[model samples]
Target: ATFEIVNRCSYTVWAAASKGDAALDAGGRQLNSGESWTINVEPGTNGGKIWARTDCYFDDSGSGICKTGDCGGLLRCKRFGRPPTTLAEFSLNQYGKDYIDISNIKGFNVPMDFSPTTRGCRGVRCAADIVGQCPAKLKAPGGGCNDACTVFQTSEYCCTTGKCGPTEYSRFFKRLCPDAFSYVLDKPTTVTCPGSSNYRVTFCPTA
Candidate 1:
């Protein structure tokens, strides 16, 4: 139920983390460089998210929009965000254990890292010039990259039928960011760690 976040990007980034009603943080503060945050999850919380929003502006009540990585235009982000985000998903204190997975299925916005900080656990990283190399059809003007499912939305890329597999579009991302969850069926990249372990979620990490 532990987590630490690092924002190494040169610009300001608003941190977002949400789980079940119990352990959550979102529509949160704008973290500038040389500063960071920590978020703890309630036991049994699952399917939560860790993401950083760039180019964001929020009102006094924490309501606003972001050029990228917005959670439904809500600053408090009572829920998950929209497409083109470098997101990390986690399940905390489930059976006294935990899980972590990084995803490019939503899209690619920022370079990120998810690593276990203790218990000799493993880590995963997703970083590269993905937006610069993004396919012309999936490139976003906001410096992000969209996914094939976003452009095409076929069962091939959307995985709506639950029978999806790797495709050429996903392969492009998989080739560039192998440690990330390229699609719904990318189970090989899923990982587990002890519940007591602290996980570090870093943005724009230096390899």
Candidate 2:
């Protein structure tokens, strides 16, 4: 017979099914909410109560553990509905024509490290740490800061102690990683250096 696992709640979940109600083996794979696994019911397979558990946070490594919030998939193991690092504000389907340009990033969500939006606040990208502070972290690059922020190394700018220092017209991106999109870079802006560059679609599915 075919067995289906169902999530009886609105929250995200993780689950696993087994042949018997006995102790699981050393390497058993647990199932996840909104996910289903199918196994043939052989003659030796014993029927037991359908079992599952919530509060398991899925990880990017595809493992399930007892924790709260959602994991796995494109958003990849992030807190369920947690504010995006850079909310697209706009939507981009798997196969849509909406292309994002790094040089022109007003199209993305505002980074609100200080004053937050009623909707939610996207977390500061690692790049933002290189910049000093934000009137709001979202518009950071505007107040004299670096582009791609990193402490001491250097992508587009350089850090002394921990501050990414400053630059003009580059805060909007430092606060937010406009580079998250898979667009190309006429110039690859790093935290140390904020130069006029274009976005390039390189990794993952830009489609």
Candidate 3:
């Protein structure tokens, strides 16, 4: 029920997570480069999402905006953030052990590593240069790469049980981050960790 966040990017990252109604880590916290943060989530929490915001300017009163992954321009987020955001998602113990993945279904901005430090669990990462290699059509206005589903909204990419197949766009993302969920139904993106495990999420991860 603990998640550790490490900022390896040259720039600072504002760490954030949301699941159910309670915001983890006061909803968000500023992580300076090379700094690390640890956040606690209750054992029963499920469907939690964690991410980082970049290029943020916040006032002392938890008010500000981020160029990417900004949740309503508030430093403390109570909801999911905007798209073009890389996600470390977890469904913790409704039926069994914790399930986790690196989800790019919304989009991608910064590189990340979502790995378990114990139990020898297989980790997932989205440490690709998606922003640079993003197709022009899938590029967001300021920065970050948009997933095909988010851009086009077709069932083929969005899937929601629409019977979808791999597309050129999904393939592009898959090639870069095979461990990430490039689309709605990507393979090799989900894994399990022990219920008592702690996860490490690194921003701008290198290898």
Candidate 4:
């Protein structure tokens, strides 16, 4: 299947996709406004996640800093993005369906939409202006909203205990992005569609 990532925002985005420690699409690439990048992902791949980096200043050696979603400051990410990032996560070709979601459980920086463009499945998105409306306490230092876990680090917010559910903090995210995973144990956030040959992920999608 083809996993496509598109940059619909006015600014440039450094997009990254990975499965475990292995980088996809030569690690990452820069996408200008209205540009897109696609990579082939075979079936049965687990822990597939994609995210965008913003406010980045990488040197010719590909080592630099990103204000948001910086993966250890590496051009080729060797791990997942840090918190305060909007994540499009997937488990492809599982039991003939694709499991996808926009997760804010780590907090949100940019708006994102994930869908099967042609057919065979519905879509999910967290395209709200979370940054503008973020609560004072949950706002990150540089920018974006920080998940309760990042701020509180308690069992209630982190769900480190048994069957903990959404708190008032998580509710804030759910109120805006009903389809996104707002908390650690958010179940309804996961969207399923029949396995397709292609899927689309758009950053800052239009209404």
Candidate 5:
């Protein structure tokens, strides 16, 4: 299967992807406005994730930092990005199905849409203006909205303690991105695509 990464934002965004232990194609690349790149994956590729890094500056060696969604300053990321990032999570051919979702549990830096290229699969999007409307206390320095966990780091908001649920902060993100995983306990975000399917991941789809 193949995953197409499309940048619809006006500015540049460094796209990053991590697929388990294997080094997938297009691990790190800069996508200017309207530019796109594709990465191919095998049938059983699992635990794959895609995200965009903003306000980044890299040296010739592809080593530097990003204001949001920095992956240990490595251009070719082999791990997940930091918080205050919009995430497209997927598990291909896992247990006979393709699991996918747009996650805001770590808060949002950009708008995104994920669509399946195969039949019988509905597309999902979270394209609200999260950065402009981000709460003051949860605002990121460069841009984007920080999750309650990133801002407070309390057990109540992080939900790392005993059984917990969404609080007022998480509810705010849920209201904007109703289809995304707004909190750790968000349950309505999962989507499924059948086998042998490809996907289109668009950043700032509304723009």
Candidate 6:
């Protein structure tokens, strides 16, 4: 199977080996960063191992959907067997051979062993963000930044997966803004936040 990753950040992504599913502590060692990669695996032997420790987070058991951005928030895995396959096709888009050449990057084709048991959010603060204390008046316009000034406005409203976003939104960003404007990919594109603090672009990538 082909494991593809889209570098949404401005900096080149060098995904190191995500700690194996309960291999060591929580965080693992860093290998490399920059660009993306997709490796072919013996899906049959590994029992549906989508990716290695490089980006793969879960084990071969295949139980829960490996929450996006869990281990180092880089790997994404999906089953590939049958038609009407959405995830399969989507992964192939950005990192597909026709799109970007991941192999070009130096020392990126690294792989690690899979974990025996799956591990994910136990008591982790899954909430992406919390709306600060504010008066009820600031909900709409003229409501001030509180009711009006939504803290995670874009996040709480649209595709707020507490992380990056729903894959659908990832696709939308790719479709609408297929250039530097799109944060979903890094291709000589320069994107900045609103002002105060934000790694994500305040506005949609547009002219």
> Which residues of candidate 3, in runs, are more than 4 Å off?
none
Task: Give per-residue lDDT, candidate 3, residue 98.
Answer: 84
Task: Write model 3 residue lDDT over 1-207, tens digit each, in one string.
Answer: 778899999988899898737687678899999999888877757889999888899988888889888888888888888888999999877566888899888889899999987784788888879989998899999679988887898879889776888899988888888888877766756887777677899999894
- Candidate 3 deviation (Cα RMSD): 1.7
The lDDT of model 3 is: 0.85
Local distance difference test values of all predictions, in order: 0.80, 0.27, 0.85, 0.84, 0.85, 0.22
- Segments in model 4 whose C-alpha atoms lie over 4 Å from true places: none
lDDT of 6 by residue, 125-176 (tens): 0011101222233222221112111223454223245443333323332343
Clash number for every model?
A: 1, 34, 0, 0, 0, 11
What TM-score, computed on C-alpha atoms, does each candidate reach?
A: 0.92, 0.23, 0.93, 0.94, 0.94, 0.19
TM-score of candidate 3 versus the correct structure, residues matched by position:
0.93
Which window of ten consecutive residues has the lowest lDDT sum in model 3? 18-27
Give the worst 10-residue stretch by lDDT in candidate 1.
20-29
Model 6 TM-score relative to the real fold: 0.19
Q: Give stretches of model 5 more than 4 Å off.
A: 20-23
> Which ranking of candidates, highest TM-score first?
5, 4, 3, 1, 2, 6
Better of 2 and 3 by TM-score: 3
Q: Could you report the Cα RMSD, in angstroms, for every candidate shown?
A: 1.9, 20.1, 1.7, 1.5, 1.5, 17.7
Residues 33-146, model 1: lDDT tens digits: 747787766676778888888898888877789887887666666666667888888887779788888899989988898999888569889978787899898897775898
Please give me the total number of clashing residue pairs in predicted model 4: 0
Candidate order by decreasing lDDT: 3, 5, 4, 1, 2, 6
